Amino acid sequence: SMQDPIADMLTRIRNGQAANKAAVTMPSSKLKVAIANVLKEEGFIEDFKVEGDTKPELELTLKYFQGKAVVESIQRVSRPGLRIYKRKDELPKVMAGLGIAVVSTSKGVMTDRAARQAGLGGEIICYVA
Amino acid sequence: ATVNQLVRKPRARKVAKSNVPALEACPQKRGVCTRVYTTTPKKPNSALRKVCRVRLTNGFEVTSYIGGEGHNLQEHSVILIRGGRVKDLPGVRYHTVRGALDCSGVKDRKQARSKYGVKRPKA
Amino acid sequence: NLFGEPDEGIVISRFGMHADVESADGDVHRCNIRRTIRSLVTGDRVVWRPGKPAAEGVNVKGIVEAVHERTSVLTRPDFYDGVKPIAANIDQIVIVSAILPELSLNIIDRYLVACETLQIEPIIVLNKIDLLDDEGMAFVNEQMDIYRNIGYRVLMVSSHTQDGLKPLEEALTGRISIFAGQSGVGKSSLLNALLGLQKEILTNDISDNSGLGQHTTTAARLYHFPHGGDVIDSPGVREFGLWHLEPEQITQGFVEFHDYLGLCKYRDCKHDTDPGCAIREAVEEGKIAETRFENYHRILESMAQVKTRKNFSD
RNA sequence: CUUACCACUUUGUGAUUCAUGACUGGGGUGAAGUCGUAACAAGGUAACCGUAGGGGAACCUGCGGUUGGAUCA
RNA sequence: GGCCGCAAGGUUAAAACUCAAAUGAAUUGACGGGGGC
RNA sequence: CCCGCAGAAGAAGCACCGGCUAACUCCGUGCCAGCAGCCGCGGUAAUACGGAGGGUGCAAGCGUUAAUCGGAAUUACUGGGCGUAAAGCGCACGCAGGCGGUUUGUUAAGUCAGAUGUGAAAUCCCCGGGCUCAACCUGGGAACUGCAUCUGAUACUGGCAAGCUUGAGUCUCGUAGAGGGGGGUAGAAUUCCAGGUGUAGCGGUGAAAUGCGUAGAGAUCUGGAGGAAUACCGGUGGCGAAGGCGGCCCCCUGGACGAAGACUGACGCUCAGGUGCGAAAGCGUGGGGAGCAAACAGGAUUAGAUACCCUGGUAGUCCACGCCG
RNA sequence: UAGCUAGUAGGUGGGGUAACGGCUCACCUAGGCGACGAUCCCUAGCUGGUCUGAGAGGAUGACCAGCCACACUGGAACUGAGACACGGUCCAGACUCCUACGGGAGGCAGCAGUGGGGAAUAUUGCACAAUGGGCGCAAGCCUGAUGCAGCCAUGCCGCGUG
Ligand SMILES: Nc1nc2c(ncn2[C@@H]2O[C@H](COP(=O)(O)OP(=O)(O)NP(=O)(O)O)[C@@H](O)[C@H]2O)c(=O)[nH]1
Ligand SMILES: [Mg+2]
Ligand SMILES: [Mg+2]
Ligand SMILES: [Mg+2]
Ligand SMILES: [Mg+2]
Ligand SMILES: [Mg+2]
Ligand SMILES: [Mg+2]
Ligand SMILES: [Mg+2]
Ligand SMILES: [Mg+2]
Ligand SMILES: [Mg+2]
Ligand SMILES: [Mg+2]
Ligand SMILES: [Mg+2]
Ligand SMILES: [Mg+2]
Ligand SMILES: [Mg+2]
Ligand SMILES: [Mg+2]
Ligand SMILES: [Mg+2]
Ligand SMILES: [Mg+2]
Ligand SMILES: [Mg+2]
Ligand SMILES: [Mg+2]
Ligand SMILES: [Mg+2]
Ligand SMILES: [Mg+2]
Ligand SMILES: [Mg+2]
Ligand SMILES: [Mg+2]
Ligand SMILES: [Mg+2]
Ligand SMILES: [Mg+2]
Ligand SMILES: [Mg+2]
Ligand SMILES: [Mg+2]
Ligand SMILES: [Mg+2]
Ligand SMILES: [Mg+2]
Ligand SMILES: [Mg+2]
Ligand SMILES: [Mg+2]
Ligand SMILES: [Mg+2]
Ligand SMILES: [Mg+2]
Ligand SMILES: [Mg+2]
Ligand SMILES: [Mg+2]
Ligand SMILES: [Mg+2]
Ligand SMILES: [Mg+2]
Ligand SMILES: [Mg+2]
Ligand SMILES: [Mg+2]
Ligand SMILES: [Mg+2]
Ligand SMILES: [Mg+2]
Ligand SMILES: [Mg+2]
Ligand SMILES: [Mg+2]
Ligand SMILES: [Mg+2]
Ligand SMILES: [Mg+2]
Ligand SMILES: [Mg+2]
Ligand SMILES: [Mg+2]
Ligand SMILES: [Zn+2]
């Protein structure tokens, strides 16, 4: 059964980039909305929108700067089988800081950069490059 | 595979089997030759290998190789054995220290004398 | 040195990696062989040397350096292996047959052809006559006489009852005799009876089951005859086929055929149905043993079946 | 002087362990012996799996199964 | 050894010892009591 | 520690040199003697064995053995795999356990932040200092990645409460199906028995033989008895968790799928142990036994045929109930 | 190696301890532990640390430092602030030693040293001069701790053999 929606969203994005789709659609979620907001802020994804009220759906517009996928690598790090929590100092750096690691801190969901600049540690949702 | 499986049972490493069990991690041992006999090697090699079966101090009985040309070993000889392995001799995993308290050095050996207990020729 | 001065010796028996060698003094020892030696069988005469006799209060393995040139030798062709010798320096072979394991006028003929090609004097013995009834004895003798009618020494002996050995003993004295034949025919038991070896030491003897007997003796061992000479126990054999021998050498092997060579109008007379084949009519009037003629033909046609292999036997 | 606790010990026994061991079962390695050649090509009766019976030996036969089998408009 | 089985045996399951290989796919050739022209 | 005296005067060995791996030639030998960490060498010019010369490395040491870690991602947390190389239980249900859709509220257990206390000294590291240098000793610092307590943070996981319907399940209406269990029945065919006709062979093989037939075989017709299996349909077809399931009909019964609508409201996934099902062969008891057929009997072939082939043929094959797994 | 446990797990009361407590006893309750591995079996002193490793880890606990346990084997207590006491006591056992056969004596796992085992590991040395410690007002006495020396290429570092 579906036991992790976040990895599902990540793999939907990945397979959409591989199949060169233009827009993907997940069953939305507050957490899914927050992660999508991060990737729109970081210029990873062009835009996102939520429709419906009883069964809301999130829709994402994938980017392709040279026709090649803008997000060339994305992977869930803290999975349900094994959670991952990092303290502020030991927060990771994706591609030596060229990429972005999304972390949920006590002050919401933010990039590793914003987190350690705010001095806050959290669960590492995933790595986006 | 799954972390849960590793938690239910951790990864058990592979302990190494010592190829010289009769040594008991001792660099050398002392034994008495109960029998000296000539054996034959594996198919690529043809020879009459001089080996001796030795009853060790710690109760173990093993067959040991005798290096160099010729030996003075006989029955009831108190020799010293060392670790090692002979490829073409199946079941022989020990050498004899030439020059160790019963076995003399090799006669007229001139090179690699220390490997056969041959004192430096007076010159 | 760890070894004694080299000396001449006989090969009492061969066991793969190492053989049994008797020195001129008459003491037998297990002795290794040098890899340069290629062939070494029972009866061979070798130069060897024993090891210094001080190890565990017993003797150490000797080394055999070389073998002397064989005088005679008994060989047998082996598919996948070519012709291989069983025993060398032999003087006489004794074809040992027995009624119970198998009666084979065909194996006896193959052996006769072989020994005729090897110039070795043969002798036919038929073992276990104790099993046959008196009528059956008269039913086996009137075809065992087939060979004694061409001079072959034919004897009938019962190893279990030691019956009629005595002429066999006489014929065995002062010669070198290899006991050959199919497995189960009684070659080991016959040797036990004749040699009268100590009860503690006897050759392995298992009884035959159903159609054919086991292969108990898997070796060839020399034994010193009580009166004089030597015998050799050999392992039983199944097929003594002769593809190595040329087809003409088979016509020569049948001794009852020289009486008719050059009497066939066709010079290249295959003698089967070619017109004017002298031995054809010879066997028509009973001069030749019909069974011998048919055996000759069938072993010839057998050579055609076993010529399929491209291996060489020279 | 007595009573309680109690180390040692003695039996009746049980369990367990070590050393040795009569007498054996199979195994392994060497291999230049012996008997046949079991498999590899359709290996000359396709091999193999489970099971049962048989046989000096590799093996043979029955039952079901597989292709990890060739040939076959 | 345990458990199971009436039994045949099944399941769980070592170690001593021994070798430098064992193996999978594919390549070129050679061979087939394999086919085709 | 310093000064003085004499004299090069008192002081160099060990391993290796085929590749890995820096270093090569002669002689002896001739699958012998021997070497060898691994591949490996030696049978007449051996750079691999022994000796010599030459060279390479290290040096008051040098080698060998033992032992540990590494290289080894070769137990893979960092950081491995399972179609054929080792590896998916035969299949299913299912307790414990692991994990868990979506919204709101609360809690602060996990988690994060801060603070405090502590984490002996030595040792490790850094900047210095002292032994003529170094080893060594030593000052200060760093570190001791840990633990504990307290105060907060509430995004995520957990707990609590209230929901929601998208997961899961129920209902209504139908469809297809060798799904399963039980009981009847049918038509071919094999064999057997009895009878009718009637002659001399039948049967079998590559060829034969064994075998059956003059009491009449085989052939053909009629009647009967019994057992087992369901040509054609038939399929790259269907059904079942798997093993498996094939004439027709009846009785009982499981699952799947489709349309529309309602209903419940996370009730879910997986599953160590456990339970159940589970081809063929096999075992127990009792029936049944047509055909087939291990074992066995026989005839051929063959050295033999203990096999393949042929003539027979028992267990078994079938049924009931257990067992086997 | 799947069950183990009856002072067993609790309670009340008494006793006992420097101190809480089944620490002990009487009675009462019938619990307690265990698949988050009890019990049983084998092995083992623990740590700071040491070796290796880029790191995570791996191996390990020789020297030095902290803790623990033991002092021929088994048991017990006394004395004392502190012991169930290495060079104290009692008993029992084994062994060794003395014997007048009546009975007695002993404990190097302190420093040297001997035999034995082993491939293998050193002197039956000097001094309390220094630092510690015991006693003493002190002087001072004692200290095989310690400071030094001896032996060993066992290791590291340095130098020479021109
Ligand atoms: N009835 C009977 N049996 C006999 C007689 N002689 C020997 N036997 C038996 O037949 C068997 C023969 O075995 P064996 O002698 O080993 O046979 P082999 O012919 O020597 N050859 P192999 O060794 O290969 O079997 C034994 O059981 C033996 O005792 C005899 O005269 N009569
Ligand atoms: Mg052969
Ligand atoms: Mg025999
Ligand atoms: Mg061929
Ligand atoms: Mg074959
Ligand atoms: Mg075949
Ligand atoms: Mg059979
Ligand atoms: Mg199947
Ligand atoms: Mg080089
Ligand atoms: Mg060469
Ligand atoms: Mg040369
Ligand atoms: Mg050399
Ligand atoms: Mg040199
Ligand atoms: Mg590793
Ligand atoms: Mg792998
Ligand atoms: Mg395989
Ligand atoms: Mg496999
Ligand atoms: Mg499966
Ligand atoms: Mg959730
Ligand atoms: Mg849960
Ligand atoms: Mg904190
Ligand atoms: Mg510290
Ligand atoms: Mg300095
Ligand atoms: Mg919550
Ligand atoms: Mg509702
Ligand atoms: Mg299970
Ligand atoms: Mg069945
Ligand atoms: Mg039955
Ligand atoms: Mg029955
Ligand atoms: Mg048949
Ligand atoms: Mg026959
Ligand atoms: Mg039924
Ligand atoms: Mg109380
Ligand atoms: Mg009180
Ligand atoms: Mg211990
Ligand atoms: Mg590493
Ligand atoms: Mg430890
Ligand atoms: Mg010590
Ligand atoms: Mg002692
Ligand atoms: Mg007191
Ligand atoms: Mg104490
Ligand atoms: Mg004391
Ligand atoms: Mg003492
Ligand atoms: Mg001492
Ligand atoms: Mg003082
Ligand atoms: Mg004193
Ligand atoms: Mg020194
Ligand atoms: Zn003619």
CSV table of N, CA and C (backbone and C1' of nucleotides) in Angstrom, one decimal, chain F residues 158-192:
chain,number,residue,atom,x,y,z
F,158,G,P,3.1,9.2,12.9
F,158,G,O5',3.4,9.1,14.5
F,158,G,C5',4.1,7.9,15.0
F,158,G,C4',4.2,8.0,16.5
F,158,G,C3',2.9,8.2,17.3
F,158,G,O3',2.2,7.0,17.4
F,158,G,C1',4.6,9.6,18.1
F,159,G,P,0.6,7.1,17.4
F,159,G,O5',0.2,7.7,18.8
F,159,G,C5',0.6,7.0,20.0
F,159,G,C4',0.3,7.9,21.2
F,159,G,C3',-1.2,8.4,21.3
F,159,G,O3',-2.0,7.4,21.8
F,159,G,C1',0.3,10.1,21.8
F,160,C,P,-3.5,7.3,21.2
F,160,C,O5',-4.2,8.6,21.8
F,160,C,C5',-4.3,8.8,23.2
F,160,C,C4',-5.0,10.1,23.5
F,160,C,C3',-6.3,10.4,22.7
F,160,C,O3',-7.4,9.7,23.2
F,160,C,C1',-4.9,12.3,22.7
F,161,A,P,-8.5,9.2,22.2
F,161,A,O5',-9.3,10.5,21.8
F,161,A,C5',-9.9,11.3,22.8
F,161,A,C4',-10.5,12.6,22.2
F,161,A,C3',-11.2,12.5,20.9
F,161,A,O3',-12.5,12.0,21.0
F,161,A,C1',-9.7,14.2,20.7
F,162,A,P,-13.3,11.3,19.8
F,162,A,O5',-13.6,12.4,18.8
F,162,A,C5',-14.5,13.5,19.1
F,162,A,C4',-14.4,14.6,18.1
F,162,A,C3',-14.7,14.2,16.7
F,162,A,O3',-16.1,14.1,16.4
F,162,A,C1',-12.8,15.6,16.7
F,163,G,P,-16.6,12.7,15.7
F,163,G,O5',-16.8,13.2,14.1
F,163,G,C5',-15.9,12.9,13.2
F,163,G,C4',-15.4,14.1,12.4
F,163,G,C3',-15.3,14.0,10.9
F,163,G,O3',-16.6,14.3,10.3
F,163,G,C1',-13.3,15.0,11.7
F,164,C,P,-17.1,13.3,9.1
F,164,C,O5',-16.0,13.5,8.0
F,164,C,C5',-15.9,14.7,7.3
F,164,C,C4',-14.9,14.6,6.2
F,164,C,C3',-15.1,13.5,5.2
F,164,C,O3',-16.1,13.8,4.2
F,164,C,C1',-12.8,13.6,5.9
F,165,U,P,-16.9,12.6,3.5
F,165,U,O5',-15.9,11.9,2.6
F,165,U,C5',-15.2,12.6,1.5
F,165,U,C4',-14.2,11.8,0.9
F,165,U,C3',-14.6,10.6,0.1
F,165,U,O3',-13.8,10.3,-1.0
F,165,U,C1',-13.2,9.9,1.8
F,166,U,P,-14.4,10.1,-2.4
F,166,U,O5',-13.3,9.4,-3.3
F,166,U,C5',-12.6,8.3,-2.7
F,166,U,C4',-11.2,8.2,-3.2
F,166,U,C3',-10.3,7.2,-2.5
F,166,U,O3',-9.4,6.6,-3.4
F,166,U,C1',-9.4,9.3,-2.3
F,167,G,P,-9.6,5.1,-3.8
F,167,G,O5',-8.7,4.2,-2.7
F,167,G,C5',-7.3,4.0,-2.9
F,167,G,C4',-6.7,3.4,-1.7
F,167,G,C3',-7.4,2.1,-1.3
F,167,G,O3',-7.0,1.0,-2.0
F,167,G,C1',-7.0,3.4,0.6
F,168,A,P,-8.1,-0.1,-2.4
F,168,A,O5',-8.6,-0.7,-1.1
F,168,A,C5',-7.8,-1.6,-0.3
F,168,A,C4',-8.4,-1.9,1.0
F,168,A,C3',-9.8,-2.5,1.0
F,168,A,O3',-9.7,-3.9,0.8
F,168,A,C1',-9.9,-0.7,2.5
F,169,G,P,-10.8,-4.6,-0.2
F,169,G,O5',-12.2,-4.6,0.5
F,169,G,C5',-12.3,-5.4,1.7
F,169,G,C4',-13.5,-5.0,2.5
F,169,G,C3',-14.9,-5.1,1.9
F,169,G,O3',-15.3,-6.5,1.9
F,169,G,C1',-14.7,-3.0,3.0
F,170,U,P,-16.5,-6.9,0.9
F,170,U,O5',-17.8,-6.2,1.4
F,170,U,C5',-18.3,-6.6,2.7
F,170,U,C4',-19.6,-5.8,3.0
F,170,U,C3',-20.7,-6.0,1.9
F,170,U,O3',-21.4,-7.2,2.0
F,170,U,C1',-20.5,-3.7,2.6
F,171,C,P,-22.0,-7.8,0.7
F,171,C,O5',-23.3,-6.9,0.3
F,171,C,C5',-24.3,-6.6,1.2
F,171,C,C4',-25.2,-5.6,0.8
F,171,C,C3',-25.8,-5.8,-0.6
F,171,C,O3',-26.8,-6.7,-0.7
F,171,C,C1',-25.1,-3.5,-0.4
F,172,U,P,-26.9,-7.7,-2.0
F,172,U,O5',-27.7,-6.8,-3.0
F,172,U,C5',-28.9,-6.1,-2.7
F,172,U,C4',-29.3,-5.2,-3.7
F,172,U,C3',-29.2,-5.7,-5.2
F,172,U,O3',-30.3,-6.5,-5.5
F,172,U,C1',-28.2,-3.5,-5.0
F,173,C,P,-30.1,-7.9,-6.2
F,173,C,O5',-29.9,-7.5,-7.8
F,173,C,C5',-30.8,-6.5,-8.4
F,173,C,C4',-30.2,-6.1,-9.7
F,173,C,C3',-29.7,-7.2,-10.6
F,173,C,O3',-30.8,-7.9,-11.3
F,173,C,C1',-28.1,-5.5,-10.6
F,174,G,P,-30.6,-9.4,-11.8
F,174,G,O5',-29.6,-9.2,-13.1
F,174,G,C5',-28.8,-10.3,-13.6
F,174,G,C4',-27.8,-9.7,-14.5
F,174,G,C3',-26.7,-10.7,-14.9
F,174,G,O3',-27.2,-11.5,-16.0
F,174,G,C1',-25.6,-8.8,-14.1
F,175,U,P,-26.6,-12.9,-16.3
F,175,U,O5',-25.1,-12.7,-16.8
F,175,U,C5',-24.8,-12.0,-17.9
F,175,U,C4',-23.3,-11.9,-18.2
F,175,U,C3',-22.6,-13.2,-18.1
F,175,U,O3',-22.7,-13.9,-19.3
F,175,U,C1',-21.4,-11.6,-16.8
F,176,A,P,-22.8,-15.5,-19.3
F,176,A,O5',-21.3,-16.0,-19.3
F,176,A,C5',-20.4,-15.4,-20.3
F,176,A,C4',-19.0,-15.6,-19.9
F,176,A,C3',-18.7,-17.0,-19.3
F,176,A,O3',-18.5,-18.0,-20.3
F,176,A,C1',-17.8,-15.4,-17.9
F,177,G,P,-18.9,-19.5,-20.0
F,177,G,O5',-17.7,-20.0,-19.0
F,177,G,C5',-16.4,-20.0,-19.5
F,177,G,C4',-15.4,-20.2,-18.3
F,177,G,C3',-15.7,-21.3,-17.4
F,177,G,O3',-15.3,-22.6,-18.0
F,177,G,C1',-15.2,-19.5,-16.1
F,178,A,P,-16.4,-23.7,-18.3
F,178,A,O5',-15.7,-25.0,-17.6
F,178,A,C5',-14.6,-25.7,-18.1
F,178,A,C4',-14.0,-26.6,-17.1
F,178,A,C3',-13.1,-25.9,-16.1
F,178,A,O3',-14.0,-25.5,-15.0
F,178,A,C1',-11.9,-27.7,-17.0
F,179,G,P,-13.9,-24.0,-14.4
F,179,G,O5',-13.3,-24.2,-12.9
F,179,G,C5',-12.0,-24.3,-12.7
F,179,G,C4',-11.6,-24.2,-11.2
F,179,G,C3',-12.1,-25.2,-10.3
F,179,G,O3',-11.3,-26.4,-10.3
F,179,G,C1',-12.7,-23.2,-9.3
F,180,G,P,-12.0,-27.8,-10.1
F,180,G,O5',-12.4,-27.9,-8.6
F,180,G,C5',-11.4,-27.8,-7.6
F,180,G,C4',-12.1,-27.7,-6.2
F,180,G,C3',-12.9,-28.9,-5.8
F,180,G,O3',-12.2,-30.0,-5.4
F,180,G,C1',-14.1,-26.9,-5.4
F,181,G,P,-12.6,-31.5,-5.8
F,181,G,O5',-13.8,-31.8,-4.8
F,181,G,C5',-13.6,-31.9,-3.4
F,181,G,C4',-14.9,-32.1,-2.7
F,181,G,C3',-15.8,-33.2,-3.2
F,181,G,O3',-15.4,-34.5,-2.7
F,181,G,C1',-17.1,-31.3,-2.9
F,182,G,P,-15.7,-35.8,-3.5
F,182,G,O5',-17.3,-35.9,-3.4
F,182,G,C5',-18.0,-36.2,-2.2
F,182,G,C4',-19.4,-36.2,-2.3
F,182,G,C3',-20.0,-37.2,-3.4
F,182,G,O3',-20.0,-38.5,-2.9
F,182,G,C1',-21.1,-35.1,-3.5
F,183,G,P,-20.0,-39.7,-3.9
F,183,G,O5',-21.4,-39.6,-4.7
F,183,G,C5',-22.6,-39.8,-4.0
F,183,G,C4',-23.8,-39.6,-4.9
F,183,G,C3',-23.8,-40.4,-6.2
F,183,G,O3',-24.2,-41.7,-6.0
F,183,G,C1',-24.4,-38.1,-6.6
F,184,G,P,-24.2,-42.7,-7.3
F,184,G,O5',-25.6,-42.4,-8.0
F,184,G,C5',-25.8,-42.9,-9.3
F,184,G,C4',-26.6,-42.0,-10.1
F,184,G,C3',-26.6,-42.2,-11.6
F,184,G,O3',-27.4,-43.3,-12.1
F,184,G,C1',-26.3,-39.9,-11.2
F,185,U,P,-26.7,-44.5,-12.9
F,185,U,O5',-26.7,-44.0,-14.4
F,185,U,C5',-27.9,-43.3,-14.9
F,185,U,C4',-27.5,-42.3,-16.0
F,185,U,C3',-26.6,-42.9,-17.1
F,185,U,O3',-27.4,-43.6,-18.0
F,185,U,C1',-25.7,-40.8,-16.4
F,186,A,P,-26.7,-44.8,-18.9
F,186,A,O5',-26.0,-44.1,-20.1
F,186,A,C5',-26.8,-43.2,-20.9
F,186,A,C4',-26.0,-42.4,-21.8
F,186,A,C3',-24.9,-43.2,-22.6
F,186,A,O3',-25.5,-43.8,-23.8
F,186,A,C1',-23.9,-41.3,-21.7
F,187,G,P,-24.9,-45.2,-24.3
F,187,G,O5',-24.6,-44.9,-25.8
F,187,G,C5',-24.5,-43.6,-26.3
F,187,G,C4',-23.1,-43.3,-26.8
F,187,G,C3',-22.2,-44.5,-27.1
F,187,G,O3',-22.6,-45.1,-28.3
F,187,G,C1',-21.0,-42.8,-26.0
F,188,A,P,-21.8,-46.4,-28.8
F,188,A,O5',-20.5,-45.8,-29.5
F,188,A,C5',-19.4,-46.6,-29.6
F,188,A,C4',-18.1,-45.8,-29.7
F,188,A,C3',-16.8,-46.5,-29.6
F,188,A,O3',-16.4,-47.2,-30.7
F,188,A,C1',-16.8,-44.6,-28.2
F,189,A,P,-16.3,-48.8,-30.7
F,189,A,O5',-14.8,-49.0,-30.0
F,189,A,C5',-13.7,-48.2,-30.4
F,189,A,C4',-12.7,-48.2,-29.4
F,189,A,C3',-12.3,-49.5,-28.7
F,189,A,O3',-11.5,-50.3,-29.5
F,189,A,C1',-12.6,-47.9,-27.1
F,190,U,P,-11.5,-51.9,-29.4
F,190,U,O5',-10.6,-52.2,-28.1
F,190,U,C5',-9.3,-51.7,-28.0
F,190,U,C4',-8.7,-52.0,-26.7
F,190,U,C3',-8.9,-53.4,-26.2
F,190,U,O3',-8.0,-54.3,-26.8
F,190,U,C1',-9.5,-51.9,-24.4
F,191,U,P,-8.5,-55.8,-27.2
F,191,U,O5',-8.6,-56.6,-25.8
F,191,U,C5',-7.5,-56.6,-24.9
F,191,U,C4',-8.0,-57.0,-23.5
F,191,U,C3',-8.8,-58.3,-23.4
F,191,U,O3',-8.0,-59.5,-23.4
F,191,U,C1',-9.8,-56.6,-22.1
F,192,C,P,-8.6,-60.8,-24.1
F,192,C,O5',-9.6,-61.3,-23.1
F,192,C,C5',-9.3,-61.6,-21.7
F,192,C,C4',-10.5,-61.8,-20.9
F,192,C,C3',-11.5,-62.9,-21.4
F,192,C,O3',-11.1,-64.2,-21.1
F,192,C,C1',-12.6,-61.0,-20.7
